[model samples]
Target: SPVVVEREREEFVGFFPQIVRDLTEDGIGHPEVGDAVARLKEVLQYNAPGGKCNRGLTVVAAYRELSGPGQKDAESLRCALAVGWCIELFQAFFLVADDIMDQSLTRRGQLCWYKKEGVGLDAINDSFLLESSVYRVLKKYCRQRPYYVHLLELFLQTAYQTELGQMLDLITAPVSKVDLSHFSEERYKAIVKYKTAFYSFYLPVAAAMYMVGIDSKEEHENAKAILLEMGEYFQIQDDYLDCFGDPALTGKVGTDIQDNKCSWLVVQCLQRVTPEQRQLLEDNYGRKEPEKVAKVKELYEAVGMRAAFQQYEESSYRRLQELIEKHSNRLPKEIFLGLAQKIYKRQK
Candidate 1:
């Protein structure tokens, strides 16, 4: 992580207390509904803050870049942090659901929410709590703003788009099926564009843009293009790390191979695999056993996925430069550039 991103990560931990207080004490808490409020707080505390907060912070950073008074007024500052947390919980809702879908054991170095004692399948219902809470937060914090309708529309559309991407992802790589034909560069791009790219990249800056009243029809269109490109590149890096990144550093056990997830490595290696390498994958991929997992990892090694990944990283940075320059009309170029700088060579 770079200096400013590092600073922001720590800087934001300070903004969280009142968030829970509002959610716990005011938003969800009612004297008569103590049981429900208490249970929701438990879910929020455990699930909401698990991420590095990059996406949440990006909302504020973009607002800071666009507005001279980013957090001058108390209510102004409150809304930004609260809306920023909206994105975090929006993501938390998905992750809580995704972990169950993928049968993930751990995330952010802790047991997945569904895997917790007594949680089991009940985590599915809890996932809806996180999702509903996202709307609850937006309405509670941002409802009176002039841009409230815009915020509502943006989130609704993104939820639809992201789940559609998830639909493609699950259909492509069924849990028991290892059909490589479903994995390709085109489909992968489609998946990332809808699922990870729009929500992670576009949502953050776009939320800020709306907050600052800079949101115009084509203005958002312009920013979305640049941000989504950044998202695809960033997501590919995530896919690479899932397999090659050290668990201690990444705080995750890479399950892309075992789960037969439609990862970047799988698509790229499929394009270059020889006949023998082909068999190795068909037999070994999607298997839950240790030796088979090792074989898939070895195939990735022999196929030079790391080198190809390194190559893509360099090219994508250049690609981002082109997009930023092309899209930077009235918008500031530094907003796009600073984000790429922070995330490009990130280790964790």
Candidate 2:
């Protein structure tokens, strides 16, 4: 059991602390909040680790593809690792704030970063620290490179894109502040594109490209077009998994409903449901009762959302394939295809 536990614990100590140190150098700037600052540091230390690192690891894969095999020396590897760490750091930054916003009970099968003992709204500041650590790592590894400005701009644009997406998400589906009139296929696609796709799909590869001297706007725009489509497919699959994935495989009972997520599933169901079915959804959707949630799900199934999602998933993968055909020559097909294949839900 120590091995299982240690594997999890290492994620916190091994990967997360460098970022924490970066964030807390100024923690003592306010003497009155010293204890709060300590707690904030601990919270960042605790939260920034753990989670499947496919997104983070994609940076390594992308860097490898761009720089060519074995071309990276120790210093180059360090830079790649720092970029990888930034991806993880960005996820932590968003998760700490999102857990608070969603009032989540657990993440990755443990108490949310914000919900731990001796932690609360203090996690908000910790979230800022997580975001700030990203720049620290960037400055440390990339400042001397000719492409330093490119890396900075990549990250700057990414932060703005993700935050804009977050703003749209909150507007579309504020927790317990819902009026479902805003749910539409158009709004859902926009939310998926901005909130889920941009950073998760585009940021990793785009960052790697900059690191390797491929900072052409044409290449990045081409890459973004491909990646944003991939991201949309990825998010739709995630929404599908929330409703349909086996708990053993997915590792958590789905919470999208109680969280009042503006999920694609819900949007499609809204479009398909009858007036009576819509009323049933309006009353029970997003409520915390098991029976209510179950009933809402049943209504969704009756309206053929399960089949609809299956069709959407297939169509999205096809769309991604078409985009790849058009743009893969402009970038590394192996890099984009490698990331895409890993995420396309095949048996691992």
Tens digits of per-residue lDDT for model 2 on 68-173? Answer: 6565887787687678888888888888898898788888778986687766787788888778778878897888898788878877788888899898988988
Please, what is the whole-model Cα lDDT of each candidate in the order they appear?
Answer: 0.84, 0.77
lDDT of 1 by residue, 213-302 (tens): 876999899998888898888888878887687745453445556677788888888889998898788889886799999889899999
Superposed on all Cα atoms, the candidates' RMSDs to the truth, in angstroms, are 2.5, 4.3
Could you tell me which 10 consecutive residues in candidate 2 have the lowest summed lDDT?
A: 4-13
User: TM-scores of all models?
Assistant: 0.91, 0.87
Question: Which candidate tops TM-score?
Answer: 1
* Cα lDDT over the full model 1: 0.84
How many clashing residue pairs appear in each of the predictions shown?
0, 0
lDDT value for model 2:
0.77
